[PDB]
Structure 1
């Protein structure tokens, strides 16, 4: 089942990115302005959902960039997998 396979890849990647985001915001903002993990989950899923509320964001030199870098990579990485998911839907139709 390829449909299944890429569904998995999507989920895996999402999970990975969420994890990287939690782990990303965890050690940094924990210094200057302390934030709970749920705030991170929020931010991550707020970034990959393309929402961007802005209640709390990075105020620090590296902190923004790191989030940014992860997004930029994600924004390339995001469609790769959606693109993938599309390819199978085309195979299923065939």
Structure 2
């Protein structure tokens, strides 16, 4: 759900400077949350940077809390 929100806002803002497609934006978004950091496709606008920072900040809030909640259940039968 957070992947879709990033691809929307960045691509929508990128119409002002360097028109990225959905294919090119989805590449950029999933790269930023996986924490590779290619930076071949980049935000080159005042609000585009402002969003992409917030995407990474919101990612820093979510990702570690979801991995910890998964391993919490993972620590603690015959099928039909």
Asked whether the two chains share a fold, i.e. TM above 0.5, the reply is: yes
Q: Secondary structure at the match of 1:59?
A: coil
Is there any run of 5+ residues in structure 2 with no aligned partner, and where?
Answer: none
Deviations 1:24-47 (A, max 9, x none): 112100221101111111011100
- Give the drift of 1:52: 1.1
Q: Secondary structure at the match of 1:32?
A: coil
TM superposition outliers: structure 1 runs of 4+ over 6 Å: none
TM-score scaled to structure 1, two decimals?
A: 0.76
Is there any run of 5+ residues in structure 1 with no aligned partner, and where?
Answer: 1-15
Cα root mean square deviation, aligned: 3.3
Aligned pair count reads: 79
Deviations 1:59-91 (A, max 9, x none): 111111101111111111111100110100111
Higher normalized contact order (CA 8 Å, seq sep 6+, divided by chain length):
1
TM-score scaled to structure 2, two decimals?
A: 0.88
The CA distance in 2 between the partners of 1:70 and 1:56, in whole Å, is 15
